[model samples]
Target: VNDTALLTAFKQTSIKSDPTNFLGNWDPCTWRGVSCSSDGRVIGLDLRNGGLTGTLNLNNLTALSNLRSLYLQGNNFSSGDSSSSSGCSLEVLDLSSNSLTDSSIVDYVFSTCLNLVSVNFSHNKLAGKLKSSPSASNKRITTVDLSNNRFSDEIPETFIADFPNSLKHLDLSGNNVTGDFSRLSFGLCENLTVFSLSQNSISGDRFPVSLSNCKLLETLNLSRNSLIGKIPGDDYWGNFQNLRQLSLAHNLYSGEIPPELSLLCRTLEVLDLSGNSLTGQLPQSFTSCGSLQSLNLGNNKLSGDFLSTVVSKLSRITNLYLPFNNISGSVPISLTNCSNLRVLDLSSNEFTGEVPSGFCSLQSSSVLEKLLIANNYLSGTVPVELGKCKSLKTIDLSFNALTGLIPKEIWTLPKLSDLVMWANNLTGGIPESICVDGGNLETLILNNNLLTGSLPESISKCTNMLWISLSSNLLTGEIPVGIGKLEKLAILQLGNNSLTGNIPSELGNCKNLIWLDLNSNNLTGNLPGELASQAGLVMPGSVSGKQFAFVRNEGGTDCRGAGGLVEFEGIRAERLEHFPMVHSCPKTRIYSGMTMYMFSSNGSMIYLDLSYNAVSGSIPLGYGAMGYLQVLNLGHNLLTGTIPDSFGGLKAIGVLDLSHNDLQGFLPGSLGGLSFLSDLDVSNNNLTGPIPFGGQLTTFPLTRYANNSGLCGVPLPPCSS
Candidate 1:
């Protein structure tokens, strides 16, 4: 009869199937998801993410008086068990990420479990006010995680009214949890070690001094709220010898970061004060924060020589982010001492200095992974010793006054993924060993430089390559034939160069090629027919939702040679201002800021440009197969023949250019269905009948049909009747 209650409860649920076969003929104690002591008493049941489905009655399962822990998260239970714990010994209960409709049943369980140590009912549809139970005042539950639910109301004093000592961990994040930050109180839980009220609707205009009692908290995350004021400066903050992480990001906190916070650095490991109005230099005490590893003070008004005064003293600091600040002066060579440092970001600042050559020299044993110091006034060549930093994965040195050839050692990095050094005076042909040693380089941005020479075929070795941007250089050579082997290649930009050769047929082999720009090159070839049907090339394109390349239109000569593609680390559309673009920019833009360009993260093959090339061929009938094509430019080429009727299938096309070509044939009538057409240029062609009268043709300008002697359309004078 001991097993009868368990079997009956299992049968009560409408389970689709049991992957672990818990219904096996084995003994009850030997079954999966069930734990029993040597005395044969079932003590625990873990069924989290087991693809379970049912409305379980917890009261039935509690028949085994010895059950201590029960986990049922990530399931499909609509309703729930209620009423009482039935004299059970359950100490832990978790029902997060489930479909339970209400919290009424949860209340009764907590009311009866006098020995409950922890309860997690987060990420559910449970709603209504969290009412207080008569047993709440006497229970000793140490942890309560009710986050990401529909709990909408002020902090319930009646519920947590007596949790002054027993409560040690409480998280109510990501809910409609409201509280007056000015009078917020966590005063009594001196024993609490971790607390979070992040991503809530708490609002007020002053710091709550009542929270000072939480000196034992190891982590306090109160970010993304509406609190607006300066943090308190007093001994109440210095008592946190146990605090390791403190996040107050994205709030309206103003005034100088108090020196009192330095006391936290004695034990603090991570501290984020980003996106606040906090002004003035960091307090002097912070210069010696020995225990700090990650300290983010970005997007604040803080100013001073952090590099020379503070960072030089952070011997164990790893991730130090100070972007969007006004700090100036050269990077201190003493930074080479932060041996454990991994990520060092100082972008969007006024830093002026040569990168410290001591970083990757033989004298140093740095294991840094990410070094982002872009958008600065840095000068001097990147040292060749960069090769020694074998652990470096990301190196962003863009938007600076740095000059000289790219270090060849950069190509030898086996783990290097992103190498963005655009918008500088960088020269030198890409190294022949680009991927000769099997590098993992994925996003390469060397555009807007005075780079030269042929693209080495060894690049095919970088099988992980996705975005390749080498535009606006003095390069002379054919597109590397080996590039077709990069199966994941999505974007390829070699435009504005003197490159000569056929548009490689092998290019069509790249099933994921989304954007291709060979415009302004001496490229010559028939539009490859393989491009027509590459099986989900554009529609089902895969970028994993990561914005990688800057897909844009470019400009080289007299508003011509537009359309360019490039790559980067993070794509922020707001970071494109203040740039003064020189050559190879877009017709409608002159700012050199690459972020101003549209980036690709989702579907693909939206752009194809070969304009101004010496290419000669009929528009591939399959070219119309590009369903996602938004811009198709082939103007000023030697192409001929009638426009493909297949092109009518380009439902998303916005720009169609075929001007100055030797093409001579009747226009496809089906193309008139292109309602998305924004720019249609077919000028200087040999012959054409009256333009089709439907779709977006009327919206096009008359100049699109100019120079074509036999061409006639509504915008132009009608055909001679």
Candidate 2:
């Protein structure tokens, strides 16, 4: 019977970890993660994350008569603790995080747990004012996880109109919980589905409508909380068709962003309103989010040039994180049509010039692999057409002034692992074709550039490089034994380099070297005791990717082609692609000599963009039997898909751009059946998805889906993937 006999039966308990009796006999039913019952008693006490901290006295255990599930989450459980000893047959109580400022232990655990299904005093420091269920009584106490916690007042609209009928999942996040949305009480949980009142102060101008009767919500987290108004224009966001995940980040939400919430199309997928104060532009009805994959409107005050309406309408976006705000001009010739984009953070904001000559037409079956546009004020050059982004593994164009040559098609990107172009006024010379197919390059920053010759013995084919910054470069020579085959090197900056090195005791075989900068480099040896003889090893993949594009004029045809089957005009003309294709929908929407043909049966159409007008012929092979066309814009058209079997059934097509246009062919292997295809424009196309193959389509870096395909891939090489 140790730990002061369970702190003398709980009136203000406090015993963090290791009070070790390990429950040996202080009985109350063998403790440690307790679970008793059959007669032994204690019904379930988890004590999660066990880094416990103080006071949680449930009347000193009350000789355990069957206490049902009491998990002390995180922990701190002490704050002006009080106990009127209700110990009312507890049934699932989780003191989340903790610092429990007992409000009579939450009115005696809500009038004695009474078969409570679940309750988590999230985070905690529990405050007051939630009183209500004195009677209208319905109580079955559904699942509740009081988020963060500090509970202020108001939220008692008859405690969800008399709780019970198995309330689904309700989380009162952080907390300053206020009320009024017509005194919210949606007929008490018609089977809710995770509704969280984040941070809470819930103001939305007192109401007219917020959360249109939850209607079986899917996951709504009112982030940071302090909610404002404007969301209720009736259709209540088209009745959240089973919303997927919506976080009203940092709150105080102002207007714009609601075009009936993109009609909740395809059951939205993760939309977080970063910070808040959302402004205008970014709503071309927001491309009706086609199953959006994670869009966080960083900060906010959103301006225009929404890169061709969010890459022609969020084609299953894969994480587009906007940074800061006040978005300025340039960059966005429809952002290289946004290929399946994987994590693209347009940093800082106020964007300026350069960058985006169809920003490296990323292809090679891209998922777009992460690209952060650091700072911004971008200048010329720098676009070696982004070394033809072959699923570019992660490239941060730091700061920006980006001047001349560095382009060996961006250091031979085979997924140019991680390359951060630091500061940048770049003067270049380092192109031994940028790291010559180095074992899948990884983190190679060209620090504060003015870069001059000397280092490239193909930097030892990068051997899975790891952090190697050539700081303030003007490089001399010597430091190269292929950097001793880069044994998974970690941070090796040749700072202020004029390097003359003798420091290679084989640089102690790198053995996962952590940080070894040769500051003010003029290196003269002596630091080599086999560079601290090798040690344990462990290294693998990391760092991420993303990139954007746009450039004009090259009008040929198939502009961003493939997925074309039907091409009709007036009545019908027949030249189809995929799924149920037909035509003659437009009649006065615009037509000249009167020619418009487009039909489909397969082009598994994602979105078939119809640009300005003109309309000619060609593009008809069923519009390239769409296999699941993501988005294919016929840009200022003339028309064509440039048959390579006219893009064989675009697997799960992403975006296929077709800039200005005329007509032609070549370039196609059924366009690699576009697996989750990302944006690939057929700029000023005569035609092409840029034919030429090998591994990863030779890193898709050829300008605008490559000059209407004289066609070649992998940054226009003799071709590969």
Candidate 3:
């Protein structure tokens, strides 16, 4: 059991990662993350997250002596197939998360290393079919996890026949795998501790009955599949005694959770049964699940006192999400006792009454980090107690009748960052003393509130702030100049307010300001040319994969606003079709989907709106430098000067609004190059000449060119030659 050759093998490759100084001529036995016997026979190598790069040559590593384990997870090593000497002397190998791309390396490793007991090649790019074991007596072979890969369509009986009774942790999740459990015998793996086959194309109508034989199992995951029909009742659940982790979510399964499933509460630690059509009342036995730390039953049809019952006893629980279940009644104060609770999402339900203030009780002030209870009928003031839960990082009370001033302490939460309180009756100004001692305030969304008072200058103290939206509020006074000091600011939406004064010239200093909206304000003066200084800057840490869309717009006599940016939760995009939106002032809707923004640079104020204001002066020619500019609205203004041909340089602009302005001169033919122009409004302008004819410019409705003088084109009346 000795293969101590990794010392030389590491030197053959570039092992330069975060720690180059650690490997400075150190002896093999004294190296970091290494364990050896008194005789210097290295037994293990644990180099997880060591950024170990270069090709891992198993053949050269085979020269090692008595190395039984090699844990090189989260590295940059590209492993190749090998016919190594002496089977490499390793019983366990954990190359779990790396950039490995070899397909036959599994067979190459397993066939040669006959004594291999475990292999965790998870989150790699191995795409070939899973091969069978070459040795008939691979009794030591166990623990196989090729999860998060490109492999597909595993043969039904392959894994079963390969490991037989020795299979323990069998996880092939996060692949394109397809297998029919109903056609395979699974009872043989009686010693199983984990069996996860989630996020695959497995479309079995019924789960394998023989799976119940795995009484020693600790985890069983079967989520993100097309499995249908009622979930197996007490018969299937009662067999799990030592089971700790059970997951069956994002499937088409129906019916209620088996009341007896609570039998595992004595040992169960993680239970996820969300994203299904689970109906009927929940069992009271859940109150007995004292050991359960994480339970996710969202987007289901569950009914019951998940609060008064389960919440009162689960003091050890860390996370609890029960959104979209229509769970009724006031929140139980017992939740305060859950001293270790970190994340709690109870949105989109029927919970009423004030949020319990016990979260900050002296007995258990909570270890909370995220607390979300949006879209409920909860009344009364926003909890003052929440301000004391200093551990809070994100607090979203977005949709409710909640009122009262945001407690001053809220701005002092040292770790507090994202506080979204949109669509509420909350009053009072965003505090002026926001984190005087360098706070972590990032996303602050108080849109559609009864908030009053001028934008505070102290906001500049929050240097790390990214997003700040106070749209549709009674906020007054001039926009603060200090706002430009927030170097990392990405979005600033202060639309539909009574704010008066000139747009700050220093705003151009906010290089990362991408989504700027100052529409429907009483602002005046020339559009600051400094605003164009953000042309080349890209938004740092862009919210990329998180998707948003302009589902619909607010229509008026002319162009009004477009879609709302409500946070969507359901996994399905089509689910929103059934649930019609009731809110207005739409411009965007952020939903859960594969919506991707592929702008090369994340930096931009893609949306710039000075519309419905008394602004005057020329459209800044320097604005053409806005490489990612999309929607530029300057409608209903006293703007002067010609529509610069530089406007054509705004390549990414989709909706360009110069309507109801004093703009003069010819419409530049360069505007013809705007290929993605979706909504163009030049109406009521002093522009001249025939409309440009290239790209999608002429595709607009004739009304877009109606009020413009001397405008002639295909859509408009042609000028007489």
Clashes of each: 6, 83, 23
Winning model by lDDT:
3
TM-scores of the candidates are: 0.82, 0.32, 0.85
Q: Write the residue-wise lDDT of candidate 3 on 453-567 in tens digits.
A: 9988988887878778788899999988998888888778888899999999989888677778888889998999998887776654544454343344534225454334444
Q: Mind giving the per-residue lDDT tens digits that candidate 2 earns over 1-721?
A: 3433443354234564444344233354555676667755557767677666666666555335456677777766675445445345666787777778765666566666677777777777777877744122426676877676666867765576566656788777777877654666656357788887776767655432434666778897878866676544446767768888988888777787777677776688888888888887566776767788888888788878775666446767778887777788876766555566667787767789977645355454556666777677778877766666566677777666787776766666677677777657787577565556632677777765788877876677777776676665787876766677887765565655677746556766755544454534555433333543432232222311112111111232332222222111111111111112112121111111321112222112233444433445555554455444455555554554354465556555565555666667665665564556545655566664445452233444455564454555456544444
Candidate 2: deviation at residue 582, Å?
Answer: 42
lDDT of 1 by residue, 506-556 (tens): 786776777788877898888888765563433333444443434344332
User: Using TM-score as the measure, what is the rank order of every candidate, best first?
Assistant: 3, 1, 2
Instruction: Report the Cα RMSD per candidate.
Output: 5.0, 21.5, 4.8
lDDT of each: 0.74, 0.60, 0.76
User: Which is the winner by TM-score between candidate 1 and candidate 2?
Assistant: 1
Pitting candidate 1 against candidate 3, the one with the higher TM-score is 3
